[PDB]
Protein backbone atom coordinates (compact mmCIF):
# COMPACT_ATOMS: atom_id res chain seq x y z
CA UNK A 1 0.00 0.00 0.00
CA UNK A 2 1.89 3.05 1.09
CA UNK A 3 4.75 4.12 3.43
CA UNK A 4 3.73 3.89 7.09
CA UNK A 5 6.79 5.76 8.10
CA UNK A 6 10.41 6.53 7.60
CA UNK A 7 12.73 6.62 10.68
CA UNK A 8 16.31 7.52 9.86
CA UNK A 9 17.03 6.00 6.44
CA UNK A 10 14.86 2.89 7.33
CA UNK A 11 11.47 2.64 5.78
CA UNK A 12 8.28 0.84 7.10
CA UNK A 13 6.02 -0.16 4.24
CA UNK A 14 2.44 -1.39 5.08
CA UNK A 15 2.05 -4.19 2.55
CA UNK A 16 0.76 -7.73 2.03
CA UNK A 17 2.51 -11.10 2.90
CA UNK A 18 3.70 -12.28 -0.56
CA UNK A 19 7.45 -10.98 -0.06
CA UNK A 20 10.07 -13.44 1.11
CA UNK A 21 13.20 -12.85 3.31
CA UNK A 22 15.86 -10.77 1.48
CA UNK A 23 13.41 -10.35 -1.42
CA UNK A 24 13.84 -7.07 -3.34
CA UNK A 25 10.94 -4.46 -3.42
CA UNK A 26 10.77 -1.72 -5.78
CA UNK A 27 9.55 1.51 -4.45
CA UNK A 28 7.62 3.57 -6.92
CA UNK A 29 7.85 7.30 -6.10
CA UNK A 30 5.73 9.89 -7.81
CA UNK A 31 8.89 11.84 -8.89
CA UNK A 32 9.11 9.54 -11.94
CA UNK A 33 12.09 7.74 -10.22
CA UNK A 34 12.32 4.17 -8.90
CA UNK A 35 14.45 3.21 -6.02
CA UNK A 36 15.24 -0.28 -4.91
CA UNK A 37 15.13 -1.62 -1.37
CA UNK A 38 15.79 -4.91 0.41
CA UNK A 39 13.80 -6.31 3.14
CA UNK A 40 15.66 -6.43 6.36
CA UNK A 41 12.55 -7.99 7.97
CA UNK A 42 9.12 -9.11 6.85
CA UNK A 43 6.53 -8.94 9.60
CA UNK A 44 2.70 -9.18 9.67
CA UNK A 45 1.10 -6.76 7.05
CA UNK A 46 4.21 -4.69 6.95
CA UNK A 47 7.88 -4.84 5.81
CA UNK A 48 10.97 -3.09 7.15
CA UNK A 49 13.23 -2.07 4.34
CA UNK A 50 16.27 0.18 4.19
CA UNK A 51 16.50 1.80 0.73
CA UNK A 52 19.77 1.06 -1.26
CA UNK A 53 19.23 4.06 -3.44
CA UNK A 54 18.38 7.71 -2.34
CA UNK A 55 17.47 8.88 1.07
CA UNK A 56 14.60 11.31 0.28
CA UNK A 57 11.96 11.53 -2.44
CA UNK A 58 9.63 9.78 -0.03
CA UNK A 59 5.97 10.58 0.29
CA UNK A 60 3.45 9.61 3.03
CA UNK A 61 0.73 8.10 0.80
CA UNK A 62 1.55 9.15 -2.82
CA UNK A 63 4.01 6.21 -2.80
CA UNK A 64 3.02 2.94 -4.48
CA UNK A 65 4.81 -0.38 -3.93
CA UNK A 66 5.42 -3.40 -6.00
CA UNK A 67 7.49 -6.46 -5.17
CA UNK A 68 10.42 -7.35 -7.49
CA UNK A 69 9.87 -11.00 -6.87
CA UNK A 70 13.55 -11.84 -6.76
CA UNK A 71 15.82 -12.20 -3.72
CA UNK A 72 19.22 -10.80 -3.89
CA UNK A 73 21.61 -12.94 -5.78
CA UNK A 74 24.78 -12.13 -7.69
CA UNK A 75 25.27 -12.74 -11.40
CA UNK A 76 28.65 -14.57 -11.35
CA UNK A 77 30.54 -15.50 -14.53
CA UNK A 78 33.84 -16.85 -15.88
CA UNK A 79 35.11 -13.32 -16.64
CA UNK A 80 34.64 -10.86 -13.88
CA UNK A 81 38.24 -9.90 -13.68
CA UNK A 82 39.79 -6.94 -15.49
CA UNK A 83 36.48 -5.09 -14.81
CA UNK A 84 35.43 -2.47 -12.29
CA UNK A 85 32.06 -3.08 -10.52
CA UNK A 86 30.10 -1.44 -7.74
CA UNK A 87 28.09 -3.38 -5.26
CA UNK A 88 25.05 -1.20 -5.96
CA UNK A 89 25.74 -2.11 -9.64
CA UNK A 90 26.07 1.31 -11.09
CA UNK A 91 27.83 1.92 -14.45
CA UNK A 92 31.22 3.34 -14.02
CA UNK A 93 32.61 0.80 -16.47
CA UNK A 94 30.54 -2.29 -15.70
CA UNK A 95 28.29 -2.82 -12.80
CA UNK A 96 24.76 -3.69 -14.24
CA UNK A 97 26.07 -5.88 -17.04
CA UNK A 98 28.74 -8.26 -15.84
CA UNK A 99 27.68 -11.59 -17.58
CA UNK A 100 25.93 -14.48 -15.73
CA UNK A 101 26.12 -18.18 -15.57
CA UNK A 102 24.73 -18.65 -12.06
CA UNK A 103 22.88 -16.51 -9.58
CA UNK A 104 24.23 -17.20 -6.13
CA UNK A 105 22.98 -16.28 -2.61
CA UNK A 106 25.02 -13.74 -0.71
CA UNK A 107 23.99 -15.78 2.32
CA UNK A 108 26.04 -18.65 1.14
CA UNK A 109 23.71 -21.14 2.76
CA UNK A 110 23.68 -23.67 -0.32
CA UNK A 111 27.36 -24.32 -1.14
CA UNK A 112 29.09 -23.05 1.99
CA UNK A 113 32.69 -24.12 1.49
CA UNK A 114 34.70 -25.10 4.44
CA UNK A 115 38.11 -26.67 4.92
CA UNK A 116 38.27 -30.39 5.61
CA UNK A 117 41.83 -30.45 4.19
CA UNK A 118 44.46 -28.83 6.27
CA UNK A 119 45.87 -25.42 5.27
CA UNK A 120 48.10 -26.68 2.61
CA UNK A 121 50.94 -24.78 0.82
CA UNK A 122 52.61 -21.47 1.60
CA UNK A 123 51.30 -18.18 0.23
CA UNK A 124 54.15 -15.56 -0.36
CA UNK A 125 53.92 -11.82 0.33
CA UNK A 126 57.63 -11.04 0.22
CA UNK A 127 57.41 -9.39 3.61
CA UNK A 128 59.55 -11.15 6.17
CA UNK A 129 57.45 -9.95 9.12
CA UNK A 130 54.27 -11.62 7.59
CA UNK A 131 55.86 -14.95 6.22
CA UNK A 132 58.46 -15.77 8.85
CA UNK A 133 56.58 -14.84 12.01
CA UNK A 134 53.04 -15.80 11.43
CA UNK A 135 53.30 -17.72 8.14
CA UNK A 136 50.35 -17.94 5.62
CA UNK A 137 48.83 -21.20 4.20
CA UNK A 138 46.14 -21.66 1.62
CA UNK A 139 42.68 -21.14 2.96
CA UNK A 140 43.85 -19.09 5.93
CA UNK A 141 42.03 -16.05 7.37
CA UNK A 142 44.75 -14.13 9.16
CA UNK A 143 43.85 -10.35 9.76
CA UNK A 144 45.92 -7.19 9.43
CA UNK A 145 45.30 -5.09 12.42
CA UNK A 146 46.31 -1.50 11.73
CA UNK A 147 45.52 1.82 13.36
CA UNK A 148 43.85 5.18 12.85
CA UNK A 149 46.13 8.21 13.41
CA UNK A 150 48.39 6.36 11.23
CA UNK A 151 47.22 5.50 7.59
CA UNK A 152 45.68 2.00 7.63
CA UNK A 153 44.84 2.67 3.93
CA UNK A 154 48.67 2.99 3.15
CA UNK A 155 49.38 -0.49 4.74
CA UNK A 156 46.56 -1.94 2.53
CA UNK A 157 48.16 -0.32 -0.60
CA UNK A 158 51.69 -1.86 0.12
CA UNK A 159 50.06 -5.32 0.45
CA UNK A 160 48.14 -4.63 -2.80
CA UNK A 161 51.30 -3.55 -4.68
CA UNK A 162 53.56 -6.34 -3.79
CA UNK A 163 50.61 -8.76 -4.42
CA UNK A 164 50.88 -10.53 -7.73
CA UNK A 165 54.66 -10.79 -7.84
CA UNK A 166 53.59 -13.32 -5.14
CA UNK A 167 52.28 -15.85 -7.76
CA UNK A 168 55.83 -16.09 -9.26
CA UNK A 169 57.23 -16.61 -5.80
CA UNK A 170 54.86 -19.56 -5.45
CA UNK A 171 55.58 -20.81 -8.90
CA UNK A 172 59.22 -21.24 -7.84
CA UNK A 173 58.12 -23.23 -4.73
CA UNK A 174 56.33 -25.66 -7.21
CA UNK A 175 52.93 -27.44 -7.02
CA UNK A 176 51.14 -24.15 -7.95
CA UNK A 177 50.44 -23.96 -11.64
CA UNK A 178 46.95 -22.48 -11.60
CA UNK A 179 45.64 -18.78 -12.10
CA UNK A 180 45.76 -16.06 -9.52
CA UNK A 181 43.03 -13.63 -9.00
CA UNK A 182 42.56 -10.80 -6.56
CA UNK A 183 39.05 -9.95 -5.60
CA UNK A 184 39.12 -6.42 -4.07
CA UNK A 185 36.17 -5.25 -2.03
CA UNK A 186 35.90 -1.53 -0.96
CA UNK A 187 33.25 -0.34 1.44
CA UNK A 188 33.51 3.04 3.26
CA UNK A 189 36.60 3.90 1.13
CA UNK A 190 37.27 7.54 0.09
CA UNK A 191 37.36 8.60 -3.62
CA UNK A 192 40.95 9.62 -3.37
CA UNK A 193 41.90 6.21 -1.75
CA UNK A 194 39.91 4.36 -4.37
CA UNK A 195 42.14 5.83 -7.08
CA UNK A 196 45.20 4.77 -5.11
CA UNK A 197 44.04 1.27 -4.93
CA UNK A 198 43.33 1.15 -8.64
CA UNK A 199 46.94 2.36 -9.12
CA UNK A 200 48.53 -0.45 -7.05
CA UNK A 201 47.00 -3.26 -9.01
CA UNK A 202 47.81 -1.45 -12.25
CA UNK A 203 51.60 -0.98 -11.60
CA UNK A 204 52.21 -4.66 -10.89
CA UNK A 205 50.04 -5.68 -13.81
CA UNK A 206 47.39 -7.40 -11.71
CA UNK A 207 44.58 -5.08 -12.97
CA UNK A 208 43.65 -7.65 -15.59
CA UNK A 209 43.58 -10.27 -12.84
CA UNK A 210 41.43 -8.22 -10.26
CA UNK A 211 37.76 -7.61 -9.90
CA UNK A 212 36.79 -4.56 -7.95
CA UNK A 213 33.52 -4.05 -6.02
CA UNK A 214 33.34 -0.39 -4.85
CA UNK A 215 31.11 1.28 -2.34
CA UNK A 216 31.57 4.62 -0.66
CA UNK A 217 29.83 5.68 2.57
CA UNK A 218 27.47 8.03 0.79
CA UNK A 219 25.69 4.97 -0.38
CA UNK A 220 23.24 3.60 2.28
CA UNK A 221 24.63 1.38 5.07
CA UNK A 222 22.87 -1.86 4.19
CA UNK A 223 24.32 -1.71 0.63
CA UNK A 224 27.83 -1.11 1.93
CA UNK A 225 27.93 -4.36 3.82
CA UNK A 226 26.34 -6.41 1.02
CA UNK A 227 29.09 -5.20 -1.37
CA UNK A 228 32.08 -7.45 -0.02
CA UNK A 229 29.47 -10.40 0.47
CA UNK A 230 28.64 -10.23 -3.30
CA UNK A 231 32.40 -10.13 -3.98
CA UNK A 232 33.16 -13.24 -1.83
CA UNK A 233 30.41 -15.08 -3.69
CA UNK A 234 32.06 -14.11 -7.06
CA UNK A 235 35.39 -15.29 -5.63
CA UNK A 236 33.69 -18.59 -4.66
CA UNK A 237 32.58 -19.02 -8.35
CA UNK A 238 36.21 -18.74 -9.49
CA UNK A 239 37.52 -20.92 -6.78
CA UNK A 240 35.07 -23.83 -6.85
CA UNK A 241 33.86 -23.94 -10.47
CA UNK A 242 37.09 -23.29 -12.53
CA UNK A 243 39.56 -24.41 -9.79
CA UNK A 244 41.57 -21.15 -9.48
CA UNK A 245 43.35 -19.65 -6.47
CA UNK A 246 41.71 -16.46 -5.04
CA UNK A 247 43.13 -13.96 -2.56
CA UNK A 248 40.46 -11.61 -1.49
CA UNK A 249 41.47 -8.35 0.33
CA UNK A 250 38.51 -6.91 2.25
CA UNK A 251 38.87 -3.43 3.47
CA UNK A 252 37.66 -1.82 5.75
CA UNK A 253 36.28 -4.07 8.47
CA UNK A 254 35.67 -1.05 10.77
CA UNK A 255 33.41 0.26 7.99
CA UNK A 256 31.42 -3.04 7.94
CA UNK A 257 31.08 -2.56 11.74
CA UNK A 258 29.90 1.02 11.48
CA UNK A 259 26.99 -0.06 9.40
CA UNK A 260 25.96 -2.81 11.88
CA UNK A 261 25.48 -0.31 14.76
CA UNK A 262 23.32 2.11 12.80
CA UNK A 263 20.99 -0.69 11.52
CA UNK A 264 18.42 -1.59 14.13
CA UNK A 265 17.03 0.90 16.50
CA UNK A 266 13.26 0.10 16.71
CA UNK A 267 13.18 -3.50 15.13
CA UNK A 268 13.26 -6.83 17.17
CA UNK A 269 17.07 -6.38 17.02
CA UNK A 270 18.60 -3.52 19.01
CA UNK A 271 22.33 -2.59 19.55
CA UNK A 272 23.88 -4.35 22.57
CA UNK A 273 27.38 -4.57 24.06
CA UNK A 274 29.23 -1.25 24.34
CA UNK A 275 27.03 0.50 21.77
CA UNK A 276 28.09 -2.09 19.13
CA UNK A 277 25.55 -4.92 18.57
CA UNK A 278 25.33 -8.35 20.27
CA UNK A 279 24.85 -10.10 16.96
CA UNK A 280 28.08 -8.40 15.54
CA UNK A 281 29.81 -11.78 15.72
CA UNK A 282 27.37 -13.49 13.25
CA UNK A 283 28.04 -10.73 10.72
CA UNK A 284 31.79 -11.36 10.86
CA UNK A 285 31.20 -15.19 10.62
CA UNK A 286 29.15 -14.62 7.21
CA UNK A 287 32.36 -13.08 5.82
CA UNK A 288 34.34 -16.13 7.33
CA UNK A 289 31.74 -18.55 5.71
CA UNK A 290 33.34 -18.34 2.32
CA UNK A 291 36.91 -18.94 3.49
CA UNK A 292 39.12 -22.07 3.51
CA UNK A 293 40.15 -24.48 0.71
CA UNK A 294 37.33 -25.34 -1.64
CA UNK A 295 35.79 -28.82 -2.41
CA UNK A 296 37.49 -31.18 -4.87
CA UNK A 297 40.65 -30.06 -3.12
CA UNK A 298 42.36 -27.85 -5.73
CA UNK A 299 42.08 -24.11 -5.50
CA UNK A 300 41.56 -22.25 -2.34
CA UNK A 301 40.03 -18.99 -1.28
CA UNK A 302 42.41 -17.20 1.05
CA UNK A 303 41.36 -14.12 2.89
CA UNK A 304 43.25 -11.22 4.51
CA UNK A 305 40.71 -8.75 5.89
CA UNK A 306 42.08 -5.24 6.75
CA UNK A 307 41.00 -4.03 10.26
CA UNK A 308 41.70 -0.79 11.97
CA UNK A 309 42.12 -0.44 15.81
CA UNK A 310 40.73 3.17 16.30
CA UNK A 311 42.54 4.06 19.58
CA UNK A 312 45.33 1.47 19.14
CA UNK A 313 43.96 -1.24 21.49
CA UNK A 314 42.58 -4.92 21.30
CA UNK A 315 40.05 -4.40 24.00
CA UNK A 316 37.76 -2.23 21.73
CA UNK A 317 34.77 -4.09 20.14
CA UNK A 318 36.04 -4.10 16.60
CA UNK A 319 39.46 -5.76 17.20
CA UNK A 320 38.23 -7.90 20.13
CA UNK A 321 35.40 -10.03 18.49
CA UNK A 322 37.39 -10.45 15.36
CA UNK A 323 40.63 -11.70 16.69
CA UNK A 324 38.63 -14.69 18.31
CA UNK A 325 37.15 -15.69 14.98
CA UNK A 326 40.70 -15.39 13.58
CA UNK A 327 43.52 -17.74 14.30
CA UNK A 328 46.09 -15.28 15.36
CA UNK A 329 46.59 -11.64 14.36
CA UNK A 330 49.19 -9.25 12.93
CA UNK A 331 49.94 -6.21 14.95
CA UNK A 332 50.91 -2.79 13.39
CA UNK A 333 52.75 -0.33 15.66
CA UNK A 334 52.58 3.43 15.75
CA UNK A 335 56.13 3.87 17.13
CA UNK A 336 57.98 2.22 14.19
CA UNK A 337 55.92 4.54 11.86
CA UNK A 338 57.07 7.78 13.53
CA UNK A 339 60.67 6.80 13.25
CA UNK A 340 60.26 6.08 9.53
CA UNK A 341 60.45 2.28 9.28
CA UNK A 342 58.14 1.07 6.69
CA UNK A 343 56.23 -1.32 6.67
CA UNK A 344 55.85 -0.89 10.43
CA UNK A 345 54.92 -4.21 12.07
CA UNK A 346 55.75 -5.01 15.71
CA UNK A 347 55.89 -8.76 16.17
CA UNK A 348 55.31 -8.81 19.93
CA UNK A 349 51.63 -9.59 19.99
CA UNK A 350 51.64 -11.27 16.54
CA UNK A 351 51.26 -15.01 16.23
CA UNK A 352 49.26 -17.23 13.92
CA UNK A 353 48.60 -20.56 15.77
CA UNK A 354 48.56 -22.81 12.67
CA UNK A 355 52.18 -21.78 11.84
CA UNK A 356 53.33 -25.41 12.41
CA UNK A 357 50.74 -26.77 10.04
CA UNK A 358 51.18 -23.98 7.49
CA UNK A 359 54.89 -24.56 7.08
CA UNK A 360 56.05 -27.96 5.58
CA UNK A 361 59.18 -29.04 3.69
CA UNK A 362 60.18 -28.18 0.12
CA UNK A 363 59.14 -24.57 0.20
CA UNK A 364 59.84 -23.65 3.81
CA UNK A 365 62.41 -24.97 6.28
CA UNK A 366 62.02 -27.12 9.41
CA UNK A 367 63.83 -24.41 11.31
CA UNK A 368 61.08 -21.95 10.41
CA UNK A 369 59.04 -22.42 13.58
CA UNK A 370 62.05 -22.39 15.72
CA UNK A 371 63.33 -19.10 14.11
CA UNK A 372 60.17 -17.11 14.97
CA UNK A 373 60.35 -18.25 18.59
CA UNK A 374 63.87 -16.91 19.03
CA UNK A 375 63.06 -13.41 17.59
CA UNK A 376 60.05 -12.89 19.92
CA UNK A 377 61.87 -13.73 23.09
CA UNK A 378 64.87 -11.50 22.57
CA UNK A 379 62.78 -8.68 21.07
CA UNK A 380 60.50 -8.91 24.15
CA UNK A 381 63.42 -8.73 26.71
CA UNK A 382 64.96 -5.84 24.83
CA UNK A 383 61.74 -3.89 25.11
CA UNK A 384 61.31 -4.63 28.88
CA UNK A 385 64.94 -3.45 29.53
CA UNK A 386 64.51 -0.20 27.65
CA UNK A 387 61.65 0.70 29.97
CA UNK A 388 63.72 0.09 33.16
CA UNK A 389 66.56 2.26 31.72
CA UNK A 390 64.20 5.14 31.73
CA UNK A 391 62.96 5.20 35.31
CA UNK A 392 65.59 3.79 37.70
CA UNK A 393 68.78 3.97 35.68
CA UNK A 394 71.42 1.68 34.35
CA UNK A 395 72.03 0.10 37.82
CA UNK A 396 69.23 -2.30 37.19
CA UNK A 397 70.74 -3.33 33.79
CA UNK A 398 73.10 -6.18 33.12
CA UNK A 399 75.33 -7.38 30.22
CA UNK A 400 72.67 -9.78 28.84
CA UNK A 401 70.23 -6.81 28.66
CA UNK A 402 72.87 -4.97 26.57
CA UNK A 403 72.78 -7.76 23.96
CA UNK A 404 69.02 -7.40 24.06
CA UNK A 405 69.02 -3.59 23.61
CA UNK A 406 71.33 -4.05 20.67
CA UNK A 407 69.14 -6.91 19.33
CA UNK A 408 65.92 -4.64 19.29
CA UNK A 409 67.68 -2.12 17.09
CA UNK A 410 69.00 -4.68 14.62
CA UNK A 411 65.66 -6.32 14.38
CA UNK A 412 63.59 -3.05 13.76
CA UNK A 413 65.92 -1.56 11.22
CA UNK A 414 66.73 -4.60 9.10
CA UNK A 415 63.93 -7.20 9.35
CA UNK A 416 60.94 -4.73 9.45
CA UNK A 417 62.50 -2.14 7.06
CA UNK A 418 61.86 -3.00 3.37
CA UNK A 419 60.19 -1.73 0.26
CA UNK A 420 56.55 -1.32 -0.88
CA UNK A 421 57.63 -3.04 -4.17
CA UNK A 422 60.49 -5.08 -2.83
CA UNK A 423 59.28 -8.62 -2.79
CA UNK A 424 61.29 -11.57 -1.46
CA UNK A 425 61.33 -15.25 -1.38
CA UNK A 426 60.74 -17.09 1.86
CA UNK A 427 64.25 -18.71 1.85
CA UNK A 428 65.89 -15.18 1.79
CA UNK A 429 63.71 -13.95 4.66
CA UNK A 430 64.83 -16.89 6.89
CA UNK A 431 68.49 -16.19 5.86
CA UNK A 432 68.21 -12.55 7.00
CA UNK A 433 66.52 -13.62 10.30
CA UNK A 434 69.62 -15.64 11.02
CA UNK A 435 71.94 -12.64 10.68
CA UNK A 436 70.47 -10.88 13.73
CA UNK A 437 70.48 -14.10 15.71
CA UNK A 438 74.39 -14.53 15.30
CA UNK A 439 75.06 -12.02 18.15
CA UNK A 440 73.91 -14.34 20.91
CA UNK A 441 76.15 -17.44 21.09
CA UNK A 442 74.56 -20.95 21.07
CA UNK A 443 74.24 -21.19 24.79
CA UNK A 444 71.97 -18.31 25.24
CA UNK A 445 69.67 -19.43 22.39
CA UNK A 446 67.20 -22.20 23.67
CA UNK A 447 64.11 -21.42 21.57
CA UNK A 448 65.31 -23.93 18.99
CA UNK A 449 66.02 -27.64 19.55
CA UNK A 450 69.89 -27.87 19.79
CA UNK A 451 69.98 -30.49 16.92
CA UNK A 452 68.63 -27.91 14.42
CA UNK A 453 70.88 -25.17 15.96
CA UNK A 454 74.22 -26.78 15.14
CA UNK A 455 73.23 -26.98 11.37
CA UNK A 456 72.26 -23.34 10.82
CA UNK A 457 74.72 -21.55 13.15
Amino acid sequence: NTVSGVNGPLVILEKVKFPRYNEIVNLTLPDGTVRQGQVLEIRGDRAIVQVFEGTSGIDVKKTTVEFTGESLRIPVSEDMLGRIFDGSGRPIDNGPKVFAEDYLDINGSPINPYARIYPEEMISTGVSAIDTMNSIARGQKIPIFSASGLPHNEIAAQICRQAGLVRPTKDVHDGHEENFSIVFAAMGVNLETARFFKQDFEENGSLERTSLFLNLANDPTIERIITPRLALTTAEYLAYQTERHVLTILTDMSSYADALREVSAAREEVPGRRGYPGYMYTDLSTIYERAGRVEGRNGSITQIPILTMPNDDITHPIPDLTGYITEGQIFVDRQLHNKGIYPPINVLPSLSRLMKSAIGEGMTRKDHGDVSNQLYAKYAIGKDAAAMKAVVGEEALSIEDKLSLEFLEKFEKTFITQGAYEDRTVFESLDQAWSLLRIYPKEMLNRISPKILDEFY
Binding site: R274, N311, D313, T315, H316, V392
Partner: protein, 45 residues
Protein backbone atom coordinates in the same frame (compact mmCIF):
# COMPACT_ATOMS: atom_id res chain seq x y z
CA UNK B 1 44.84 8.36 24.03
CA UNK B 2 44.78 5.96 27.10
CA UNK B 3 42.88 2.64 26.39
CA UNK B 4 39.17 2.65 26.02
CA UNK B 5 38.28 -0.47 28.12
CA UNK B 6 40.12 -2.27 30.79
CA UNK B 7 43.51 -0.58 31.27
CA UNK B 8 42.44 -1.00 34.96
CA UNK B 9 43.92 -4.43 35.65
CA UNK B 10 47.18 -3.42 34.19
CA UNK B 11 47.14 0.11 35.80
CA UNK B 12 46.37 -1.69 39.19
CA UNK B 13 49.49 -3.61 38.88
CA UNK B 14 51.39 -0.57 37.65
CA UNK B 15 50.17 1.20 40.78
CA UNK B 16 51.40 -1.63 42.91
CA UNK B 17 54.77 -1.70 41.18
CA UNK B 18 55.38 1.92 41.68
CA UNK B 19 54.46 1.83 45.23
CA UNK B 20 56.66 -1.20 46.25
CA UNK B 21 59.58 0.36 44.38
CA UNK B 22 59.44 3.54 46.37
CA UNK B 23 59.43 1.69 49.69
CA UNK B 24 62.32 -0.59 48.84
CA UNK B 25 64.63 1.89 47.28
CA UNK B 26 63.90 4.27 50.24
CA UNK B 27 65.01 1.34 52.57
CA UNK B 28 68.15 0.80 50.42
CA UNK B 29 68.82 4.57 50.61
CA UNK B 30 68.09 4.47 54.35
CA UNK B 31 70.80 1.87 54.99
CA UNK B 32 73.37 3.80 52.76
CA UNK B 33 72.65 7.06 54.43
CA UNK B 34 72.86 5.57 57.92
CA UNK B 35 76.23 3.86 57.31
CA UNK B 36 77.61 7.02 55.45
CA UNK B 37 77.01 9.27 58.55
CA UNK B 38 79.06 7.01 60.76
CA UNK B 39 81.86 6.74 58.14
CA UNK B 40 81.86 10.65 57.78
CA UNK B 41 82.62 11.00 61.53
CA UNK B 42 85.39 8.33 61.40
CA UNK B 43 86.97 10.13 58.53
CA UNK B 44 87.05 13.67 60.19
CA UNK B 45 88.76 12.24 63.18
Amino acid sequence: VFPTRMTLGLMKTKLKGANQGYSLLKRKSEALTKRFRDITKRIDD
